[PDB]
Design a protein around this nucleic acid. Structure first.
Lengths: 126, 207, 153
RNA sequence: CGGCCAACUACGUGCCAGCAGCCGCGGUAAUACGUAGGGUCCGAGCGUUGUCCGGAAUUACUGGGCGUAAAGAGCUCGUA
RNA sequence: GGGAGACUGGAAUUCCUGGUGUAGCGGUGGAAUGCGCAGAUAUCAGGAGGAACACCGGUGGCGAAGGCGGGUCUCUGGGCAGUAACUGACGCUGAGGAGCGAAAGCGUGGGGAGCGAACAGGAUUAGAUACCCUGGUAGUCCACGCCGUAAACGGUGGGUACUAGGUGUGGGUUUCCUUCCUUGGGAUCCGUGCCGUAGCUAACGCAUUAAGUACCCCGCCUGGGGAGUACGGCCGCAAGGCUAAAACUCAAAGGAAUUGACGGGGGCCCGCACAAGCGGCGGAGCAUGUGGAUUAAUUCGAUGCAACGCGAAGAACCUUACCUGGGUUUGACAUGCACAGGACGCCGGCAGAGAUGUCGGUUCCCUUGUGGCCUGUGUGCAGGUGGUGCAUGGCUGUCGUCAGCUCGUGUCGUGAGAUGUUGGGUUAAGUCCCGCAACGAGCGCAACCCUUGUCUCAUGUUGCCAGCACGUUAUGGUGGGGACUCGUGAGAGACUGCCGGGGUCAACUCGGAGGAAGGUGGGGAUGACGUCAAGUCAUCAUGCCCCUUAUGUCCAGGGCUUCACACAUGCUACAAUGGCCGGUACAAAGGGCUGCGAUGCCGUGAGGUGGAGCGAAUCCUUUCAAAGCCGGUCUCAGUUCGGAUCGGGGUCUGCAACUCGACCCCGUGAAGUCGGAGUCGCUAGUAAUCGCAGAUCAGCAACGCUGCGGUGAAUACGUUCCCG
């Protein structure tokens, strides 16, 4: 997994840490990752309690996955971003194991939006 | 960016241009001298409420008409104010410039004057709720006023957090083209920054 | 098409042949709005067919259309959270559209050095039942038949 | 001397140095830190710490509760 | 169906045996392990064994609770009703204690069909110690004993008396309709549900079966973790159960209900959202923007939709904010306080890269107090594209042109709040109608505005020319003329107006006539309350902070154009629906004064000379196009495709094209054979394709942006899926 990091201003070593942390998420993605971008920014105002902002974007086989966090320094922001991305990838899975509980089951028990409608005869049962 | 300027929405329909002349080669320098005149009058006079300034030009002679709520303040009894404005308008390369000082009939029905008063009250010490309530009541007391909305935003009360507040009374149909909406904006100078006051006044419709 | 069907365009009859089908054909071969070139191509192909066989061109064009017109097609259907290739009956208009599109495309990938010649050869072989469009109809019917188990829904 | 709870401004500092009974205040414009003006409460005293009672109906005799907030023994028989 | 014991019935599963009988069976979302070909599955007959008892069968019965239904027989417990014969307060509760107590588990001995922890494979998965599949041992069953726990719940201890009713249903006694068949109906006693008063409760709710009103007795609680844990003890074969702390730590942990948001919850709807199509992007070359790296500097800002042909509607110098170096400080530019003046200012010379410095020539008008100019000396001060868009104003994007967002009074609730705004129908729409503890109102929706499609009146120049005359080829060119276009003023015209049918006779809806146009005709402008501390202190303004011999300011040169790469938007192609050559026909819109610039002449061509006429319905942009049509040639090739790159030669703008412009000529002739995963736009004059014009602008990096017209398709069955 190849990641490009577009930082700004002063954030020494943030790029390497972010690359190494984010690149570990490829195995979690159930489909090949086409692109991955990370941006690190810092807030100019000292009054901001969490100045560093980290954002990510992954192209998981055409599905866009993005997250954004805030932290007090580069390392914390990158770690929180990794956590958020992992959660998103978990919720995105869409393979069989991820949609086996949502497929309608039974015959008459339970009803869902895509549940098969019951077949009805022309004449009333009586 | 939410709402376009009400004057510009009805420029060709209800409202009218504030500068009346025709120029083809000399459009650019005419515009330059007009904006110079406007900024000079804005800076020089602040006490009397300057609601509007019109400029008319015809070859050499230039006619500038202004509307104020206190004409006596801006005019010299011996012409001293008139002398000063005349001389420094000649200095604006206006060739022959003549002035027609006028007065507005109902200062409380004019949006620019209302905003000026609200902002002036806001600047010194007044709580903004008091100013908005007073302006709204005074305007609605007038006969032709069918609806007034006052909105001011900024560091209200010297707070660290900016806020936007507005009160409305009656009907203010901003989307209706024929309805004439008088719009006035003026900035309040406070020690903590700048507070902007916008006023919309609706008085019937013109067909 | 969420709020209901949309009206169809009533294209006019051709002047020099008087048939709806040739206008449909020229609109199928049309590219970039150059309608005159499309009409020239179609008329040239029809005249080539008439010269080769010796009879009216519209009758052989209709014969080719009937030879390549499909009747059963397959569409992916999602019933109860599962997708399958379900054979579906084809309406007459969609069958004519599919036949014309197949004819035009498969003539576009012929090797006769000119589109008029390619089109004429394709329509002639479709009339005689040897075109690649005829083949394509054969595979589409075969695929529709091979999935007949799913026709119940 | 932010509110409880009488009594507010300026300067210095800036998530530091520090304060704090609780809530919580320090991120170059702090009525909460430090210092000066001003003020308030007491006054030969004024504050802090320690201990007991009150507030606490928070062991409820006066004067509480037990469906879901803590609280009906798993259910009976039967001794004092 | 209260319990215990004994005996016993049938269906089905499994297995075994024997026929018939073949090649699959089994299992899943889809498969594979597995079984079978040595005769499986299927079908028939026979046999063995174990376990559970379909229908009856329920919110129905019984039991103190756990719990209890195949049939029969034996033994046995409790309840209820009536009579009221009997005893005569013998009642209630109950610390400890004793007994019973689902399932799992434990011991000994049997049994073992099905199911099935553990355990094996198969599959899914990034990984599956799981869910799914195939097998399968304890166990489930019986006898006799242990254990002593459960969401052992009505999360509601037992006894008693009292406090509106209505309606189901189980058991029993009785009066009257009386057929006396009939839940006929009533009354009464004992159960078991539902709904509902008063009352109670924080609320939810309970409510004669109380969680109401009271009396008697018992058990238990005293903030959350630590912890039902350690230690000690008792019980147990064991598993473990019962009794049961503290240190330390937190300022909460909790219950009910409200408004949002969300759901791999449900319902109803929408949108190029999908589906049906057409054309693309992702591959190549180039243009442009960005990241990264590099550099003295590569100025700054913009990072999903909503940053990335964006601020930039024009970076060679300027711009320019960056770097190197050279100067300057009340300063490049303002205004005020002072001292001295008649010069400031220009014009030429020289030095310097220039800023600048120096030299030569010219010198104020007021009017006596000094005013305008600057000098220096100063002094307040100017000046910052310096910082913070998380201090702000203004301006803007976005959800979204979506239909929604609120208020007054009233009512309900302890309160947060609710109602209106929900329900049925309808619409593009909180659009409307009917209902309705609501009645109204406001911002939104719609309309009013622009353009476009038809017609009428007015109207004739620079615009038309049909009928008349003059024309010379060169044509409305010219005299003339309102007729037809056209230009621009006014007006008419679409309002479900009319008809027929559905409709609550209501909204609304379908069809038809008339009409240029039919049902908001087409397209614009118009963007509610708010959200995202969205963007912008670099248009501007601005609080605070900072610089002030510098972060201000002047100049020359350089940079913003660097390039191993990555991303994004485009253009040109990969050709015959085409390339090249010749001929030839049809537009709209717009621009033009130190600008457009024609005829002519000179070049091959950019272009050069020259300047007619034009502030322009007149002249120029050619009279305006290209795709188109006709003719000729090329013959499927890395080509007569493609044009990149490179060599040489020029033109123009500009002080100046080295870094770093555009264009022209000759030569050169790269990749590229229709582009993986994936992804984008578009519903009709639309997509595709063709040309023209404008802004910025001396020139241009423009293939970008904003407009204009030419030619002009395919497809939509329908909302299951993706997105909002």
């Amino acid at each position: 997994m190849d990641v490009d990091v577009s930082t700004d201003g002063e954030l020494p070593g943030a790029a390497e840490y972010a690359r190494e942390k984010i690149g570990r998420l490829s195995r979690r993605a159930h489909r090949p990752v086409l692109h991955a971008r990370v941006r690190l920014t810092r807030h100019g105002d000292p009054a901001v309690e969490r100045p560093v902002i980290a954002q990510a974007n992954l192209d998981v086989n055409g599905r866009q996955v993005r997250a954004q966090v805030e932290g007090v320094n580069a390392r914390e922001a990158v770690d929180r971003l990794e956590a958020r991305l992992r959660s998103r990838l978990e919720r995105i899975a869409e393979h069989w194991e991820a949609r086996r509980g949502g497929v309608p089951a039974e015959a008459g028990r339970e009803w869902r939006h895509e549940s098969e409608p019951a077949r009805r005869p022309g004449y009333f049962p009586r | 960016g939410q709402k376009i300027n009400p004057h510009g929405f009805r420029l060709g329909i209800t409202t009218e241009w504030k500068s009346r002349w025709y120029a083809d080669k000399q459009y650019k320098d005419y515009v330059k001298e007009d904006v110079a005149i406007r900024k000079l009058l804005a800076t020089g006079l602040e006490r009397a409420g300057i609601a509007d300034v019109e400029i008319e030009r015809t070859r050499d002679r230039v006619r500038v008409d202004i509307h104020t709520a206190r004409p006596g303040i801006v005019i010299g009894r011996r012409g001293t104010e008139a002398d000063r404005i005349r001389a420094d308008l000649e200095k604006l390369t206006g060739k022959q410039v003549q002035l027609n000082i006028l007065e507005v009939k109902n200062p409380e029905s004019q949006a620019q004057l209302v905003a000026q008063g609200v902002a002036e009250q806001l600047s010194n010490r007044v709580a903004f709720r008091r100013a908005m309530r007073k302006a709204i009541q005074s305007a609605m007391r007038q006969p032709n006023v069918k609806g007034i909305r006052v909105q001011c935003s900024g560091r209200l009360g010297g707070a660290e957090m900016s806020r936007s507040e507005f009160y409305r009374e009656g009907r203010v149909p901003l989307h209706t083209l024929r309805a004439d909406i008088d719009y006035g904006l003026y900035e309040a100078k406070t020690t903590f920054g700048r507070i902007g006051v916008k006023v919309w006044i609706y008085k019937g419709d013109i067909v | 098409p969420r709020k209901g069907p949309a009206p169809k365009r009533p294209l006019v009859n051709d002047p020099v042949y008087g048939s709806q089908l040739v206008t449909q054909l020229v609109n199928k071969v049309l590219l970039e709005g150059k309608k005159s070139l499309a009409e020239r191509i179609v008329y040239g192909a029809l005249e080539q067919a008439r010269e080769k066989t010796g009879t009216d061109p519209v009758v052989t064009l209709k014969r080719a259309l009937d030879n390549v017109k499909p009747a059963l097609e397959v569409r992916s259907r999602r019933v109860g959270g599962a997708t399958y290739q379900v054979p579906v009956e084809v309406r007459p208009d969609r069958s004519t559209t599919l036949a014309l599109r197949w004819l035009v495309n498969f003539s576009r990938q012929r090797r006769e050095k000119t589109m008029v010649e390619r089109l004429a050869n394709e329509i002639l072989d479709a009339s005689n039942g040897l075109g690649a469009s005829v083949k394509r109809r054969e595979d589409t019917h075969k695929m529709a038949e091979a999935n007949r188990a799913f026709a119940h829904y």
